[PDB]
């Protein structure tokens, strides 16, 4: 099934892509579009180039100018659309580490990157933070101060999951500490958006800590 885009706050839209795995069935994958007047910013690409094309069309058919994307780690469900955005001369961003992981794997790289543990896209609109390793070594989160939405990406687990998911690239014994670093930011979080699953409240962070500590102890 094709990309879905739904409004979740003023100037903030959830975009969701779908993929099938034989045996299990459909899995969903989330990113955001954030609007600033008529400027649009993409937080994580859709899971495929085709779905990325649909997202770009969503924006441009509304008269929005897509200013940039940021991807929150190197995996395909965050970065599949980087190549397409590059081809359209739309600035693409990741952390330095994410960029160099992509380069090492021979994948398309973003045209821009940031070096610090903190950075902003859209001149303050979107605050990025690297809290430490968890789902992957490079996962970052995004804080949207106006809508009070924390985009946790795949570092956070929604309530519908009772496991950490794909952990081949994970640092399980570091994961709880990394969530605690997010909590220490003292963001006035009203909503947390996971990379997979339904939007929830700040208790998603507590749930993720539980899952990480349980897995660590095994």
């Amino acid at each position: 099934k094709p990309l879905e885009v739904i409004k979740i706050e003023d100037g903030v839209y959830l975009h969701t892509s779908f993929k099938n795995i034989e045996g299990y069935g459909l899995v969903d994958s989330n990113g955001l579009v954030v609007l600033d007047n008529n400027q649009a910013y993409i937080i994580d690409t859709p899971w495929s180039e085709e779905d990325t094309k649909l997202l770009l069309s969503w924006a441009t058919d509304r008269g929005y100018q897509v200013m940039a994307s940021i991807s929150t780690h190197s995996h395909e469900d965050r970065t599949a659309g980087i190549k397409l955005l590059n081809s359209k001369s739309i600035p693409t961003y990741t952390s330095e580490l994410t960029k160099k992981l992509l380069a090492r794997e021979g994948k398309p790289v973003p045209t821009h990157y940031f070096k610090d543990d903190e950075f902003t896209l859209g001149n303050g609109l979107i605050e990025l933070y690297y809290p430490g390793a968890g789902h992957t070594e490079d996962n970052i989160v995004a804080w949207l101060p106006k809508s009070k939405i924390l985009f946790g990406g795949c570092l956070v687990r929604s309530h519908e999951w009772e496991g950490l998911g794909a952990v081949g690239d994970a640092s399980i014994s570091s994961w709880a500490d990394s969530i605690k670093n997010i909590v220490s930011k003292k963001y006035p979080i009203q909503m947390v958006v996971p990379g997979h699953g339904k939007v929830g409240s700040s208790d998603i962070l507590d749930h993720t800590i539980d899952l990480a500590e349980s897995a660590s102890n095994k």
Copy 2:
């Protein structure tokens, strides 16, 4: 992780391959190798070409001759290795319907196929039956008379699963009836092997009926 092969009965081996799905994690997929002396028959290929190569090496390193594979529906977890086996001149089989679905999807096709609802491979070694639509329109099962094992493939669900799984290609309202067609064969089933998850007893058939009927509603 790589292919795993483990003995589940004299002359019957479970092969399991793994694929990662971002968001969910590790998923497993099962097939069988069935031996007649040193002649080996593969029920469903592994989930990738690479794991299929490992399965062939497993067999030949043991001095087995791989006679044929049979795939129990068109999906990639059943058929990923057909191309490789074709390239090695190892006969590959599906039902006629499964072959035609593969062709229509532009996927590699088997070199052999059977036309009726029943077919036997080896010398009475493996009995194939098409019970009707369920997981997919083309799903078949394989019955092993000697070991009394039913390979139900992805038409049956293991007890550790709470749902039917991927139903995009399914006929949910037909699924329970199709299981009942299997039951009507009155096979003296002592073990059921699912396409995904742990091997169990014949009660896997009842469990699958329960899931199908619940979903039908």
